Symmetry: C10
Subunit: 74 residues, 10 copies
């Protein structure tokens, strides 16, 4: 039991590493948004929803990691 | 069996690392979509389905990682 | 209990790795803000709130990592 | 026998890390497709098959990782 | 007690890895500042406070990592 | 013998990590092909064999990794 | 006591990994300086102090890693 | 002897990780070749041998990794 | 003492990983030098010493890693 | 003795990881060379020696890693 519980807690920590992808990815989306709007302000209403979609889908990958983390913790 | 169970849980955690690739990749596809549309608004309806296809193929690599994770946790 | 405690401490250290994502991502958002404003100063009031949202969402991924770190430590 | 089985499951998990390469690579290919079509719409029919080939070859590297994973798992 | 002490020291070392994110991110912010000012010198007074804010927020992520490191050490 | 067998399986898993390099690299080559052809369609027949060569050489690095993996497995 | 000393030396080694962030970040800052001066030589006196500040702040993150390393070593 | 052999196998797997550098690097060289030729077709005979040298030198680093892998296996 | 010696050698190996940062950083500085000079040849004598300073500061981070490596191997 | 020798061989494998930096760095230098020459062929005699210097210094970091690897192996 002790070794199993120890493994769950180590595993839970490892399972958060993948969240770095969402941290970087969300930023990449918002950087494109800002750069696109600066170059062409008239396009903002068109590209803003694309940025929200892009962020949500990138974020979902990190939430999958967190899902595994919480299964191991709890 | 305690060693094997321990290994399943460590392995499950390690199996999620590869999801960082889809996290970054999905973002890269959507950034190109945004920059392409900002440069040439008329192209939107042509490139939007390319972005959907690209996101889905990138995401699938992460879903393979997650599949292995769930197999280790539950299988 | 000592083995479980050892694992909680190792797990907590591992759980901070993912914060590198927010470190880089917050920077990527601010770089875009700066480059966008330099190229088109008149867009500043439009893109500044986009940068704030972008950084907040990227930071949230790192805060998720830190939450797991603190759950393991406490 | 338990040490060997433990090794197989740890090894299977490690074998999925390389899939991050295909996750990023497939995206890089599709980003180029989108940017190329945006800059020169007439080139679409020419560059689309290149993107399909690029994606397939990048994905193949991740499929090799997953092959090793399943060999270790089963 | 030896096991717990060992884990604190390994955990503390691991807890510093995330600082690479701030190392890179702080640089990305200042690179943007330099490139933006080189392209449009008149914008310097507007973008400089943005760079200070961006640096501070990226640096904070590395400080959270170091916080965990010091908690494990002391 | 259990220890050696265990190490072969963990080593085999570790040996696949390097394949992420080819995953990314193959994509970088094809992205360049797409962007170069979009900018200058007349150059397609000249640069296509360059892309095939570049892909093959990047892929070779991942094949060396997989070679070690199979040696450890079999 | 030997397990604890072993942990300190393993931990000290791990504590240097984060220095890669400063290695890359310092370079990113100097790359921007060089490119900015090349594009607009007259801006040299303005951007050079920015590069010095950027380098110092990026390097500081690596110095924090090295601090933990030496704490663990000695 | 079994513990030493186990370590040689684990070490051999670890020694292939660095090949990811050549996987990416060879691609970066070929991407430049393709983009350079697309922008200036007349430069092809000048930059092609530069690409060959570039790829050879990047590949050498991966071959150094593979050498250590083979010394550990043999 | 065998455990401690073992740890010194593993730690020494791990201490070299950070050198990848200087490997990449030195390259980034020289790439900027090359691209800057290609775009504006007259600037060469101004930016060359900036590249030397930049390379040296990036390299020093790797030399800190190596210092820890040697301390673990020999100290 | 057995555990010490095992540690040397694992350490030797780990010591090659850092060579990925030189694999990528050497390529980055040669990519700049190729792109610079394509944009401005007349500059080739000036920038070629800069590329050789840049490659040598990037390569030196990997040779430092290899140095440690061979000390551990032999």
């Amino acid at each position: 039991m002790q070794l199993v519980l120890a493994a769950k807690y180590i595993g839970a920590g490892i399972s958060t590493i993948g969240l770095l992808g969402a941290g970087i990815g969300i930023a990449i989306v918002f950087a494109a948004l800002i750069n696109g709007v600066s170059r062409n302000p008239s396009i903002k209403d068109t590209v803003f929803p694309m940025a929200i979609l892009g962020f949500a889908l990138s974020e979902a990958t990190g939430l999958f990691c967190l899902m595994v983390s919480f299964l191991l913790l709890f």
